[PDB]
Amino acid sequence: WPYFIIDLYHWDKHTQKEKGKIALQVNQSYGLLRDYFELAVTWANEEFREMFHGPLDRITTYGGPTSEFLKENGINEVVLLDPWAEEVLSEKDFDVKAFIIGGIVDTNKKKTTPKIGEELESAGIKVRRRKIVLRGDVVGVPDRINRILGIILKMMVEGKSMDEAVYEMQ
Numbered sequence: 327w328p329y330f331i332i333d334l335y336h337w338d339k340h341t342q343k344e345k346g347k348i349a350l351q352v353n354q355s356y357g358l359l360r361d362y363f364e365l366a367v368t369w370a371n372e373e374f375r376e377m378f379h380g381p382l383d384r385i386t387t388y389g390g391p392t393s394e395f396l397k398e399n400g401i402n403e404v405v406l407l408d409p410w411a412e413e414v415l416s417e418k419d420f421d422v423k424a425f426i427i428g429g430i431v432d433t434n435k436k437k438t439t440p441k442i443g444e445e446l447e448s449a450g451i452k453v454r455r456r457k458i459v460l461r462g463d464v465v466g467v468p469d470r471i472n473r474i475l476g477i478i479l480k481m482m483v484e485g486k487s488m489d490e491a492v493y494e495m496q
């Protein structure tokens with residue numbers, strides 16, 4: 327029912343190896359979502375479509391800004407999965423019609439995801455910045471795009487607690 331959007335913002339600033347890792351994690355995110363239930367990829371340029379080794383016809387790919395995609399589908403509020411957020415994701419956020427995971431890979435960390443939120447709010451989108459924690463700490467939480475999606479799906483579909491979902495995906 328809800329959209330799981332992978333924001334490919336930052337794409338052209340990545341190396342070819344990092345692009346391949348992002349595309350792989352998107353492919354794994356699709357197969358994982360295929361084992362549950364609606365996967366959307368914004369800023370989805372032609373190079374990503376060429377690197378994506380999965381069924382492009384089975385996912386939603388939008389080449390332009392995430393905000394435009396959200397507005398075209400009547401979504402004014404989203405949940406942005408952000409490890410730097412101060413508030414933890416909870417069941418009070420599962421009524422939102424779109425969850426956004428940043429198409430980001432590290433090579434050592436940097437504060438990259440909240441810039442997506444600032445961009446969305448600058449375009450008029452209400453953004454709930456939500457972090458996933460294990461025992462109140464982001465340490466131990468896998469940050470791969472597919473792993474974050476798996477944690478969310480285990481909480482939303484299987485009713486697992488966050489600690490259970492994180493540890494199972496850890």
Ligand SMILES: C[S@@+](CC[C@H](N)C(=O)[O-])C[C@H]1O[C@@H](n2cnc3c(N)ncnc32)[C@H](O)[C@@H]1O
Nearest residue numbers: 407408409427428430435437438439457458469
């Ligand atoms: C490899 S992480 C990127 C980490 C990068 N240092 C940053 O600050 O965005 C890829 C995506 O997974 C999501 N993510 C990773 N860890 C998270 C966490 N602990 N809580 C919520 N979202 C997380 C973020 O949305 C991020 O865009």
